[PDB]
Design a protein around this ligand. Structure first.
Ligand SMILES: COc1cc2nc(C)nc(N[C@H](C)c3cccc(C(F)(F)F)c3)c2cc1OC
Length: 466
């Protein structure tokens, strides 16, 4: 019909092929369910309207179906739209040295070329503003973007080229607060600066949780939604695609295993009761700070194979501390029903529990197909990417919640450099912790032997009241 004749031919432009059941599926603006990468780029830079939601979702999730170099090539190809040939009358006009009417050419420029070219520049602007890490990880991608942006000519393009350049430079420079004062830093046995004596029972339980909450808050806030899409932290190139997420996972593994190591490596029953009691006090302070990540690291350590089975140790734990620890576990029951009600009812600041997002993203990634097939053609399942993007959107709503707590660099460095496993692998280390648990509290028919004390200093806790 007339509509497709106005548009460029498929032999000169790939983004003008009409929609059909084998290139795009839908669920004022229609929501895209699936499509070829060409149809996704086309609707990303559609001429009829802007789509901020689809631009946001696409730039968070595109790396799961398209490489950054390929996306740049596609939006440049999209921008280079062929203009129609002059009509027969205008060909005669031009050949006579006269100005053509160019009515359709001007219409196509105003109603199609200009909107698409401005929509391509808007993708470029959102790309550098919210995903500049793609350009830091690939210097050549930035050379190509700056060459493209630097050669764009036009009246309406001028403002866009300058705002994209302002964002690029502002991001390059970024490479190189409190309304009230924070509480007084707490000390217990270990003195400020005597890092050689820093340990679970020597540092104040309040300050251990405060400094871990700052460290975990910082770790939580550095994770970018794209580190979670396509399960890329589980794939082979995980170290480049998911550096902040892997730091968050390694911290949680190291802290949880450190709590287990402190517990099972304390062979004396009375001393081990004090260690467990101190970790529950650390959890109580994580509850006061709304650090749900920390609360569930402690629950994870208490529910581990080596610790959960220590019946003689939990027998001596006061009922008040037992009920605190049992309620913290109930945050995880019924698919984290209680955790989610708590998270939505608290006031900021908080550190949400990170593991539940990883779990739900893996369930979405494993339970939805990468493509949808229609008439023998493969279409990228975009609604799969949108569901993962919605979950990572839940992460973001809590990434602007700084804590009014003073950093203590020595305690911060102690928790950053925790290495409970040492040179052992995780599986072999957890086998060791469980074999140590059987040593300190043997199975029922075998009796309970006594063990010598290892702590010279006192075991009494200073408490959780500041
Ligand atoms: C069905 O499996 C479980 C049910 C649980 N139910 C509750 C109420 N809490 C649990 N765990 C908490 C963190 C806990 C851990 C150690 C010791 C105590 C204390 F002795 F203090 F009570 C409490 C549970 C753990 C489970 O499996 C590992």
């Amino acid at each position: 019909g007339e509509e497709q004749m106005r548009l460029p031919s498929a032999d000169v432009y790939r983004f003008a092929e009409p929609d059909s059941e084998e290139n795009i599926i839908f669920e004022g603006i229609p929501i895209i369910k699936a499509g070829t990468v060409i149809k996704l780029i086309e609707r990303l830079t559609y001429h009829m309207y802007a789509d901020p939601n689809f631009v946001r979702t696409f730039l968070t999730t595109y790396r799961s179906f398209c490489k950054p170099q390929e996306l740049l090539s596609l939006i440049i190809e999209r921008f280079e739209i062929p203009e129609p040939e002059p009509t027969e009358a205008d060909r005669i006009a031009i050949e006579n040295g006269d100005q053509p009417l160019s009515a359709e050419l001007k219409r196509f420029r105003k109603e199609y070329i200009q909107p698409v070219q401005l929509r391509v520049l808007n993708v470029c602007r959102h790309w550098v503003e919210h995903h500049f890490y793609d350009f830091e990880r690939d210097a050549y991608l930035l050379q190509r973007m700056e060459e493209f942006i630097g050669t764009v000519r036009g009246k309406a393009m001028k403002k866009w080229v300058e705002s994209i350049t302002k964002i690029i430079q502002r991001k390059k420079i970024a490479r190189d607060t409190f309304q009230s004062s924070p509480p007084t830093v707490e000390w217990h046995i270990s003195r400020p600066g005597h890092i050689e004596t820093f340990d679970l029972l020597t540092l104040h339980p309040i300050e251990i949780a405060r400094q871990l909450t700052l460290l975990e808050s910082d770790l939580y806030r550095a994770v970018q939604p794209s580190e979670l899409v396509g399960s890329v932290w589980t794939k082979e190139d995980k170290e480049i695609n998911s550096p902040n997420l892997l730091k968050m996972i390694r911290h949680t593994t190291n802290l949880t295993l450190w709590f287990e190591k402190c517990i099972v490596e304390t062979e004396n029953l009375e001393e081990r009761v004090a260690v467990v009691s101190r970790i529950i006090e650390i959890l109580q302070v994580f509850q006061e700070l709304n650090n749900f990540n920390g609360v569930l690291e402690v629950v994870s350590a208490m529910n581990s194979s080596p610790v959960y089975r220590l019946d003689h140790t939990f027998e001596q734990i006061p009922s008040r501390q037992k009920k605190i620890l049992e309620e913290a576990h109930e945050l995880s029951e019924d698919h984290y029903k209680k955790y989610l009600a708590k998270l939505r009812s608290i006031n900021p600041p908080c550190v949400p529990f990170f593991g539940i997002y990883l779990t739900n993203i893996l369930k979405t990634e494993e339970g939805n197909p990468e493509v949808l097939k229609r008439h023998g053609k493969e279409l990228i399942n975009f609604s799969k990417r949108r569901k993962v993007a919605e979950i990572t959107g839940e992460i973001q709503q809590y990434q602007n919640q700084p804590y009014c707590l003073r950093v203590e660099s020595d305690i911060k460095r102690f928790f950053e450099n925790l290495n409970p496993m040492g040179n052992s692998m995780e599986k072999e280390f957890t086998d060791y912790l469980f074999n140590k648990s059987l040593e300190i509290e043997p199975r029922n028919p075998k009796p309970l032997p006594r063990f010598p004390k290892k702590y010279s200093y006192p075991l009494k806790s200073p408490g959780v009241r500041p």
